[PDB]
Every structure is written in C-alpha cells, then in structure tokens.
Design a protein around this ligand. Structure first.
Ligand SMILES: [Zn+2]
Length: 400
C-alpha cells in the first residue's frame, strides 16, 4: 500500500479469475465431498467490486456457475459466510424469518494492529520481519490448542495478503457448533484482555492451567530474539516505563535503578526475572514464582482474540486465494510444518503471477502461486481421508 498502479487491478483480476484462480481445489473444499445435499448451494459468498461496493448473500449452484459469475463480475475481494437454511440468492422469497445461518467453519482472524500497544518496530499500517514473529507465535499457540486441547483435525491457516493471519477449522462437527460453544472456545483460549486504557492486560492466577504453561513455552522459544533483540522492549526509559507499569508499585524503584546500570534489554530482562520472582503477594505468603514475568511475556507476545469473529455463525471472512486489493498479494495458505519459514513479503502479487503466466494464458502451475495451491491440496487430501475413514465406521455400524 501502495506498490503497483491500482488502475491495472481490473485487467489483472480478469486474467486471474480466468486462468489462475484454483476453482477445482476451491470447490473440493466448500462442497465437502458433496455428501450433504445443498451444502455448497446454500453457502453465502460476498463480492466486493470497485469503490468498496459489496454484495451480500450471493450463492451458486455448482463449480461452473461460480466460475462464470466470478469471471463476469471480476470482484476485488471475495468473502465467505455461513451455510444457510436456504439459497442465499433467494433469501427474499423466504417466509417471515425462516432464513437462518445454520453452519460455518470456526474462524479466527489475528490482526497485527491489535499488537500496536506492544509493537515498536515499523508502524501501525505496516508489518516487518521484526513484528512478523507475533503471527508465527499466534499460529503455533492457537493451532497447538485447537489440535491438542480440542481435537480439531482440519485447520487451514491463511495469510490475509497484508497484516493478518486467519484460521478456518473445518471439522464436520466444528462447522455445526453453536455460537455459545464458539464463545466458550474463545474464552478458554483468551489471556490478553482487553481495553484501550487498561494498562495491564494479563492477570494470572497462582495455579497454572496446562494451556497457559504450553503457550508460555512456545513464547519462550522466541522471546529473546523477538522481544529483547528485535523489538528491544527495554531499550530506553521511555520504553521500559511501559513494562514497569505492569509490575507493582513496591518494585518500580529497585527495577528502575538497575535498569539504568545495565546496557542491554537482555541484561535488564534477566534483572526483571530475578526481581519479579522475589516479589511477595503482600503479605503472609511465602509462595514465590514467575507469574509477573509470564504476564509481561503474554501481554507482549500472546494473540488478541476478537470475540465476534469466532462467535457469529454469519460473520464474513476474506476467502483464501482472494487478492488483497491494497497490496496486490494473493491470500495464501500457510504450511503448518513450515510456519517458522513462512514469508509474507515474498508472497506473490497478482501482477507478478499474471506476468509469469505469459512470459515466454495457461495454468497456475507455471507461476509462483503453485506451491501455495499444493499446500491447499494437502489440506483437502486430509479432509478426503477423514470423510472416507468416518464413512467406513458408519458402514461398519450398518452391519448387525
Ligand atoms: Zn514491524
């Protein structure tokens, strides 16, 4: 924003939707094996066109119909909503209030601006190699929990194309989950709350739940390099006063003094850990520990979870393989086995892949888009494997 002339977007989009957008894989995803009738036909799609104009409640009969309409309207953005009780594109014809959102993937949307209070590196409208690690940590923290703590097997992670990282959890049972249960998942996962003028946003109890411990252990792999070297969070008085507002009055002064005697954020952090580990929860206690150190790390490194993104079944979220109009970047799947190597800055733009396409119009495999489609395919393969596995179990129950 802005790296190419935005007036070439319409012609690039036209070519993109004609030769490059992976419809086969995309339909395979949203049709979910085709075994539940109307599942794709009842999906809301929402297109954004030129000038921030968008259309709600579009839906399509099949792959060919979707292709044809995407190729006709050539949208700047594609959003995906819920699966509804009826065809979204006929919602007006429906009785009183029978048109209801019924099912959707459980989604998360981690937004880099939500870390602005604890970022020092680039700027509010930017990302850089110094803050990106926040997203890496957010992925590892949330995915571990979704996988290990909840048993969710089908989790697609997606880079927004700009400053965001999205998760779609797509398990059959998850898609059916109620709003109340979605909230409960968000509540369980949440540690950073949650106001503009609340200075201290993490308060830990004496007793550590395994979720908190396991999240902290992930942050600890990154904390030195990320917070002490890259962000340099205890660099000067101006910056370390922000950390001192998170510790008790009792120790503000002792820490202040030894901060000024050391030179590194590295050295000052070691001093903070020491001092904070000796703080007595006034008084009568005799029990000491790392709660304060953990609270600071969580405030700086733990993802902020917007309750509404995950709670509302009808919420729209930018589609994978949609283009980000501001950056030109394709919204691409992130390979979870390689999350530490994921590089948002080398994610190709629409113009770049259109160029590759006809440099001496065919297929996406001759462009830089290809590896990202391979990642999508592995995800889809796992969805195929599961359905077949469960169909076997169901088929074995129909035998007695
Ligand atoms: Zn940055």
């Amino acid at each position: 924003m802005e790296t190419f002339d935005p007036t070439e977007l319409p012609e690039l989009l036209k070519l993109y939707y004609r030769r490059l957008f992976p419809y086969s894989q995309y339909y395979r995803w949203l049709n979910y094996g085709g075994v539940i009738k109307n599942y794709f036909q009842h999906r809301e799609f929402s297109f954004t066109l030129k000038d921030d104009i968008y259309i709600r409640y579009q839906s399509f009969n099949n792959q060919s119909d979707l292709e044809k309409e995407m190729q006709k309207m050539n949208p700047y953005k594609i959003d995906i909503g819920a699966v509804y009780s009826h065809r979204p594109n006929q919602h007006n014809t429906v009785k009183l209030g029978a048109f209801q959102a019924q099912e959707k993937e459980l989604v998360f949307d981690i937004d880099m601006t939500d870390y602005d209070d604890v970022r020092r590196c680039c700027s509010s409208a930017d990302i850089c190699p110094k803050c990106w690690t926040l997203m890496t940590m957010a992925i590892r923290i949330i995915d571990r929990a979704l996988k290990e703590d909840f048993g969710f097997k089908h989790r697609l992670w997606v880079y927004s194309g700009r400053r965001g990282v999205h998760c779609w959890v797509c398990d059959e049972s998850v898609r059916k989950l109620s709003s109340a249960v979605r909230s409960g998942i968000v509540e369980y996962l949440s540690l950073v709350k949650g106001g503009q003028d609340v200075k201290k946003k993490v308060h830990l109890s004496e007793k550590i739940h395994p979720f908190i411990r396991k999240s902290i252990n992930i942050i600890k792999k990154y904390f030195e390099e990320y917070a002490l070297v890259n962000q340099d969070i205890l660099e000067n008085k101006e910056s370390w006063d922000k950390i001192l507002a998170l510790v008790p009055e009792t120790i503000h002064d002792e820490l202040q003094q030894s901060f000024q005697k050391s030179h590194n954020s590295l050295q000052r952090w070691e001093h903070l850990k020491k001092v904070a580990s000796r703080y007595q929860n006034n008084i009568k206690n005799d029990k000491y520990g790392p709660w304060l150190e953990w609270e600071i790390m969580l405030q700086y490194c733990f993802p902020r979870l917007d309750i509404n993104v995950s709670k509302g079944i009808n919420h729209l979220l930018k589609s994978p393989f949609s283009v980000h109009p501001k950056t030109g970047r394709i919204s691409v799947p992130i390979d979870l086995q390689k999350v530490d190597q994921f590089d948002p800055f080398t994610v190709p733009t629409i113009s770049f892949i259109c160029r590759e396409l006809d440099a001496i119009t065919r297929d996406y495999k001759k462009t830089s888009l290809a590896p990202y489609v391979k990642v999508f395919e592995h995800f889809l393969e796992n969805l195929d494997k599961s359905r077949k596995g469960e169909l076997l179990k169901k088929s074995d129950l129909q035998k007695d």
